[PDB]
Coordinates of C-alpha atoms in Angstrom, one line a residue:
Chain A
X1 CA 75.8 52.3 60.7
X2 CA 72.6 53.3 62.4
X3 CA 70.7 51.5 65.4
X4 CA 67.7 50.4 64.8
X5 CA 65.1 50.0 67.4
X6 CA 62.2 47.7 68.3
X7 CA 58.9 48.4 70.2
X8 CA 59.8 52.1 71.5
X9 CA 58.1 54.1 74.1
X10 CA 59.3 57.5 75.9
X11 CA 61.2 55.5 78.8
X12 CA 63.0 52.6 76.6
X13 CA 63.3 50.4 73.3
X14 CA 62.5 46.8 74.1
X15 CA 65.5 46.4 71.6
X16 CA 68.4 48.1 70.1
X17 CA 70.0 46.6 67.0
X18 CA 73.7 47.8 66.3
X19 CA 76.2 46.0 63.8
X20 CA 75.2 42.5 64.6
X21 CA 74.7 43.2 68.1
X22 CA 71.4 43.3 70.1
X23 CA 71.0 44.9 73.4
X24 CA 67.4 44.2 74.7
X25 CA 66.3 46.4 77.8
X26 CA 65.9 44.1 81.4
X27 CA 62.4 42.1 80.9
X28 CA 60.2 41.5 83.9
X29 CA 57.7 38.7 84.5
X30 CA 54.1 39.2 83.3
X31 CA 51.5 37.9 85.9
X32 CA 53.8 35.3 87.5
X33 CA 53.4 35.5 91.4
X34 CA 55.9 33.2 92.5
X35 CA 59.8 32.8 91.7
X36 CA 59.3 29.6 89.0
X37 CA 56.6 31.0 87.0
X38 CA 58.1 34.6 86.9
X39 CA 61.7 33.3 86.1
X40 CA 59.9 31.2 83.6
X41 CA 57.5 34.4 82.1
X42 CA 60.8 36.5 81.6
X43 CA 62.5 34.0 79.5
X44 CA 59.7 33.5 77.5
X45 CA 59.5 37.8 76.8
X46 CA 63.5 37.4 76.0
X47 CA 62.8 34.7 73.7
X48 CA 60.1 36.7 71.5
X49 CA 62.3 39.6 71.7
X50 CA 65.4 37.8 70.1
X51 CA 63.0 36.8 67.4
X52 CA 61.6 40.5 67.1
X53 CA 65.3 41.5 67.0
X54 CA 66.5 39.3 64.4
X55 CA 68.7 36.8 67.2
X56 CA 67.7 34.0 69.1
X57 CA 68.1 31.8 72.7
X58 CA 71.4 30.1 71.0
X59 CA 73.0 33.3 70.2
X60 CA 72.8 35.1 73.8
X61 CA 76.2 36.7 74.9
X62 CA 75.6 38.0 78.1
X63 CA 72.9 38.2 81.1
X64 CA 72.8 39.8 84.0
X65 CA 70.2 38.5 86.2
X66 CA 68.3 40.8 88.9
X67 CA 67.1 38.3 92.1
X68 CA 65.1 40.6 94.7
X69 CA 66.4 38.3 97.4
X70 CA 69.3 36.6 96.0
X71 CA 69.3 33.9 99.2
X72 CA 66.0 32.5 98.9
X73 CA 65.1 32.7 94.9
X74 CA 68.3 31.7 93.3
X75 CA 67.7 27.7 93.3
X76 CA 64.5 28.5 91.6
X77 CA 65.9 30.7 89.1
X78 CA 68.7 28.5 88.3
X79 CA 66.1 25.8 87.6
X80 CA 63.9 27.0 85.1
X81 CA 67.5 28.7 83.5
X82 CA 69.0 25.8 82.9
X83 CA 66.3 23.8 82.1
X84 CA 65.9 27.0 79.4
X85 CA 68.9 27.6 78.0
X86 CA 69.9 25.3 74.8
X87 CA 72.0 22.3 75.5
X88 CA 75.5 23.2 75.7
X89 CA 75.1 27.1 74.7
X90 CA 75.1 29.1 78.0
X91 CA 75.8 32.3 77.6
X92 CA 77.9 34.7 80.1
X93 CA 75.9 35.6 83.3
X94 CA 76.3 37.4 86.8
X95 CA 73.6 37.0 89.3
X96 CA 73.5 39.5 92.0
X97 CA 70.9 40.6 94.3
X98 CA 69.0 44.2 93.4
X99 CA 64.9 45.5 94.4
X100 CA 63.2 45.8 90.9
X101 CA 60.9 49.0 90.4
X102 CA 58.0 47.1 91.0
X103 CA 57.8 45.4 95.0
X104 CA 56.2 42.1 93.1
X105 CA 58.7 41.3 90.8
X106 CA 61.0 38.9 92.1
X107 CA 63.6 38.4 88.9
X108 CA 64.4 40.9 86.0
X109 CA 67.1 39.9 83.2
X110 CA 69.2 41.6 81.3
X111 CA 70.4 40.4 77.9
X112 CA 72.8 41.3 75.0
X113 CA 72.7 38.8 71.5
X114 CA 74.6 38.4 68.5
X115 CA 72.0 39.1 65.5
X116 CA 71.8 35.9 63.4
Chain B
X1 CA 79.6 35.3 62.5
X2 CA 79.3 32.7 65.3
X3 CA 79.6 33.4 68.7
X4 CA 82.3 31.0 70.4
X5 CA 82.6 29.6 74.3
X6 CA 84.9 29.2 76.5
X7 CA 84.2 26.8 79.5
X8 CA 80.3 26.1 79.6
X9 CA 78.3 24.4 81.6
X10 CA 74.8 24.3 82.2
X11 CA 73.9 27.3 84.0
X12 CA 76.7 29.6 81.9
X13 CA 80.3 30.2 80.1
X14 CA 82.8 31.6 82.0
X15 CA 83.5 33.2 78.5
X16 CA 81.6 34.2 75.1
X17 CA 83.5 36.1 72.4
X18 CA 82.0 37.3 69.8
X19 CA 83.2 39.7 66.2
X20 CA 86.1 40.7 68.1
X21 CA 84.1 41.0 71.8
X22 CA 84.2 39.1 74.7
X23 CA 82.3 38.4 77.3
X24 CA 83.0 37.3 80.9
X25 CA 80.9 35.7 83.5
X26 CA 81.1 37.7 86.9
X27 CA 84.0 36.2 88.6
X28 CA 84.0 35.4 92.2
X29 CA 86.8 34.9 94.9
X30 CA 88.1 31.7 95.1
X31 CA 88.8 30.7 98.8
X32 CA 89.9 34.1 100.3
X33 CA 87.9 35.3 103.0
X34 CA 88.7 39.3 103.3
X35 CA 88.1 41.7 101.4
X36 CA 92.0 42.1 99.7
X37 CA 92.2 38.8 98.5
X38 CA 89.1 38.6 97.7
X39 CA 89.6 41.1 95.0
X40 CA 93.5 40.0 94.6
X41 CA 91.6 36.4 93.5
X42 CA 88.4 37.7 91.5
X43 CA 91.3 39.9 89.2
X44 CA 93.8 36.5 89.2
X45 CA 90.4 34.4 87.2
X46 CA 89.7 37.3 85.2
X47 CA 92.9 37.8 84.0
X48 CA 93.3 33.7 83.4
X49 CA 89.4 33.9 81.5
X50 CA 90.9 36.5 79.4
X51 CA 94.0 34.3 78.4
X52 CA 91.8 31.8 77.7
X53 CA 89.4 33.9 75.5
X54 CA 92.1 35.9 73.5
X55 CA 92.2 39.0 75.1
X56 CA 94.7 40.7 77.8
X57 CA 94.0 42.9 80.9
X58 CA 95.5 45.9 78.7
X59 CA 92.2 45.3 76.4
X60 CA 89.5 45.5 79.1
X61 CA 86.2 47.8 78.0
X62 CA 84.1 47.6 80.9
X63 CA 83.7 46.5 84.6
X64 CA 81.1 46.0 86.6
X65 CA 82.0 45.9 90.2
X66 CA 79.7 44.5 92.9
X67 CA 80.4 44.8 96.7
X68 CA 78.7 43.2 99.3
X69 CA 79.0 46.3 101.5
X70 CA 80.2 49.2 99.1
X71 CA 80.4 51.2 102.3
X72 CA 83.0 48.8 103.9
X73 CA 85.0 47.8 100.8
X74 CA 85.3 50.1 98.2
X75 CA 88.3 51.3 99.6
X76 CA 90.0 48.0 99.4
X77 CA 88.5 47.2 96.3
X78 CA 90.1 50.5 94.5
X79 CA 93.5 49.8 96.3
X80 CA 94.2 46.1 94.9
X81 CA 92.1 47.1 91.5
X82 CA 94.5 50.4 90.6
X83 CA 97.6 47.9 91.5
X84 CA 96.4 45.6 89.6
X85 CA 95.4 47.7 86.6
X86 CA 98.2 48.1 83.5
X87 CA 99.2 51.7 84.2
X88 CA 97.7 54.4 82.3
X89 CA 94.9 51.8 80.6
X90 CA 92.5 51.7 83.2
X91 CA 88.5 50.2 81.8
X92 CA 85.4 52.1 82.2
X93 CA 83.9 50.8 85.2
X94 CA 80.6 51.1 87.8
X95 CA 81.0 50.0 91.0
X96 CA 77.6 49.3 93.1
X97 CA 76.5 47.2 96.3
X98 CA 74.9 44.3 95.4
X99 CA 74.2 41.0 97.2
X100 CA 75.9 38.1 95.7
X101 CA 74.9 34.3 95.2
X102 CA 76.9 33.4 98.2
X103 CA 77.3 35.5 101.3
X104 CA 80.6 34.6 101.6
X105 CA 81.2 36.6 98.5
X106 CA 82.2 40.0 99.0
X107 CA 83.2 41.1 95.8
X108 CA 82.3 40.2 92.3
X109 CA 83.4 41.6 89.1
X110 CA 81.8 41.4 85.4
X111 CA 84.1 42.5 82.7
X112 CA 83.9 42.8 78.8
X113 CA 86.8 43.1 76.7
X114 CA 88.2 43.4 73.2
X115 CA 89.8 40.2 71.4
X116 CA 93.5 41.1 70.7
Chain C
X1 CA 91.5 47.3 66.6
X2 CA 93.4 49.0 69.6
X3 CA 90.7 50.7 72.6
X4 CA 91.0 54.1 72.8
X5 CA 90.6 56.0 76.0
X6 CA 88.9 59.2 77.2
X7 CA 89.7 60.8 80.8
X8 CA 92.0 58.2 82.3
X9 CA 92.9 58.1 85.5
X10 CA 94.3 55.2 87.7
X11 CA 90.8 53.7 88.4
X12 CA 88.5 54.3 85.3
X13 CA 88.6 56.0 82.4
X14 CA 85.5 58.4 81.5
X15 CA 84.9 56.8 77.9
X16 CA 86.7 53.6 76.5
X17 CA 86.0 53.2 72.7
X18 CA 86.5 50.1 70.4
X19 CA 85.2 49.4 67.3
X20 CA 82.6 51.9 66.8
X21 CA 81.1 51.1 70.7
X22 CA 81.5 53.5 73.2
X23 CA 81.4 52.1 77.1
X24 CA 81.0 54.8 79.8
X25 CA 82.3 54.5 83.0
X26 CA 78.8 55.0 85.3
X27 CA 78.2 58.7 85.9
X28 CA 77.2 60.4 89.1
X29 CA 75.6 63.6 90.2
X30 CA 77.6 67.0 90.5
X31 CA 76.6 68.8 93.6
X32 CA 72.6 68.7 93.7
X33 CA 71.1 67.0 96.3
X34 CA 67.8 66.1 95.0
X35 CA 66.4 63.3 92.7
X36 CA 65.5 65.5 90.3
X37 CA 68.8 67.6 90.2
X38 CA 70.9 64.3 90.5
X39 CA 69.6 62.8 87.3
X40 CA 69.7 65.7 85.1
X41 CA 73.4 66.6 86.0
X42 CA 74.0 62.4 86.1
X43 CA 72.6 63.2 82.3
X44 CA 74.4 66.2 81.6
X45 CA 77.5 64.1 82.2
X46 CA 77.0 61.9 79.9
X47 CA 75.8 64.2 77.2
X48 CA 79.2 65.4 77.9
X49 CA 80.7 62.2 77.8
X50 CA 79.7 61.3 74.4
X51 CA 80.8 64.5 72.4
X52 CA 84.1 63.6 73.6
X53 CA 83.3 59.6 72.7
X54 CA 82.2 60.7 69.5
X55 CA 78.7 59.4 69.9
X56 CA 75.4 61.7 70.9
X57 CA 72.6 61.0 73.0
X58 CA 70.4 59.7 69.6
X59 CA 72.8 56.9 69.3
X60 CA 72.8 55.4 73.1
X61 CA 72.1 51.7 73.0
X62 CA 72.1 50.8 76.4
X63 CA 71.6 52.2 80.0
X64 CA 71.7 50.8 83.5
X65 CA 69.8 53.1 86.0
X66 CA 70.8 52.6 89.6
X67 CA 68.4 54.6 91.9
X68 CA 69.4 54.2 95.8
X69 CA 66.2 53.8 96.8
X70 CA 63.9 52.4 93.9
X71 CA 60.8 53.1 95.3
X72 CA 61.1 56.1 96.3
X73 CA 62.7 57.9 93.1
X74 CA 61.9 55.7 90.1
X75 CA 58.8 58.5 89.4
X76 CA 61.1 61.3 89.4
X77 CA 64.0 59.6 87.9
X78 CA 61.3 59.1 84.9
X79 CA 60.0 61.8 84.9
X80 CA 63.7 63.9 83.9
X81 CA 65.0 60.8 81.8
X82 CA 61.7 60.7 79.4
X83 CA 62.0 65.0 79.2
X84 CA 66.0 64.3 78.0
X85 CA 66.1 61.5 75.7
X86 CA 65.7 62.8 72.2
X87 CA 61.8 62.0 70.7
X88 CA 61.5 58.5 70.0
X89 CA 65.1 57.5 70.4
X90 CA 64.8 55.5 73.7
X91 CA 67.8 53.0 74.3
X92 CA 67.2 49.8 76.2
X93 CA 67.4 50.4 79.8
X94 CA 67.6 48.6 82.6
X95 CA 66.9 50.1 86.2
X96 CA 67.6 48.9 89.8
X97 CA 67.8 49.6 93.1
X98 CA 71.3 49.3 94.3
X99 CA 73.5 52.4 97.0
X100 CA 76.1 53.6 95.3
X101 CA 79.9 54.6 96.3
X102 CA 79.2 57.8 98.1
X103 CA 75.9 57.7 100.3
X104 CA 74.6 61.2 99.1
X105 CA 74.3 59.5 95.1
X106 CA 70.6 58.7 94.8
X107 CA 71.3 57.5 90.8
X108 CA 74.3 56.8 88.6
X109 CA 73.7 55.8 85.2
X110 CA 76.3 53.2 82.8
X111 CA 76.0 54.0 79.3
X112 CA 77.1 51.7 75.7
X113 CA 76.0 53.3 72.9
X114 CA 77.5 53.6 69.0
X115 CA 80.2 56.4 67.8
X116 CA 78.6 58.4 65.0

């Protein structure tokens, strides 16, 4: 087996494909300002990267979630999450607290999915 | 293939095991307060999430280790961690400072593992 | 399946391999001092790393950066990372700020990526 990769550039692949797994790199908001909207603008870049990828949001296995300031956004970020994820299909996930390489973004996410 | 959970509720699963894999939530202390059993308590869940999920400590891949204050902690981190550890089948593991959901939480540990 | 191990010692082990995945333990700089030194010999490492795994730097599928201080070395951390990888063979990556074990490491870099 070979991996396959989608939307490359000289940093990073969006997506690597390897034997049924899918490792997507961490996606940031787009124009979001505020902790809702950006938590909500990340999802929606995982979700069309699953589909690019060949999984999809009921097939995540894992997500690590990047908060700039773990204290004051998590509430948010666990809102729009859950309201997010599929009924019933969480996948695994460790929050922690980390300064994104840009001083605007307030959430990054990191995800690995089964190919479906 | 299907990915399978173990113990999901709306925000997560505290495992997801997948073609042989699995995946653990980050696992947090339960009421210790210092940093050794902190660690002593985060190792106790994992070990019980990997029970649950098919696989043994002897079968861990990775870790990910976050400490509150890696400059405080590490220390006591490595000394309950290489105790705890089956001898001579130590994971690959990174161990960083990261702020945790809780700032009671000094200590939090995401591991994968192989299904035995 | 049984793991295999590479460089074990009673905290990590360099490499841990199951089922054609290889899972690096998070490499750190040799002696330099600077950014730019750090993250070449953090990538000389794991070049290293994944002869002995069995993989090679065209088959890495994913990579956390930690930098120390994000803002201040993302640019150079970029600037050696894009000059190593092999020509459009990017992995997904993921980088954060986050101080590492020793205070001189300004980047350490955790590696998955396929045996080939």
């Amino acid at each position: 087996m070979e991996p396959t990769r989608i939307a490359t550039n000289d940093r990073l692949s969006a997506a690597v494909c390897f034997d049924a797994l899918v490792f997507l790199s961490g996606q940031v908001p787009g124009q979001a300002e505020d902790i809702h909207g950006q938590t909500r603008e990340v999802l929606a870049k995982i979700d069309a990267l699953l589909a690019e990828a060949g999984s999809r949001k009921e097939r995540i296995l894992s997500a690590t979630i990047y908060l700039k300031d773990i204290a004051r956004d998590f509430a948010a970020l666990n809102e729009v999450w859950t309201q997010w994820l599929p009924t019933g299909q969480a996948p695994s996930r460790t929050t922690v607290q980390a300064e994104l390489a840009r001083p605007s973004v307030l959430v990054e996410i990191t995800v690995v999915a089964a190919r479906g």
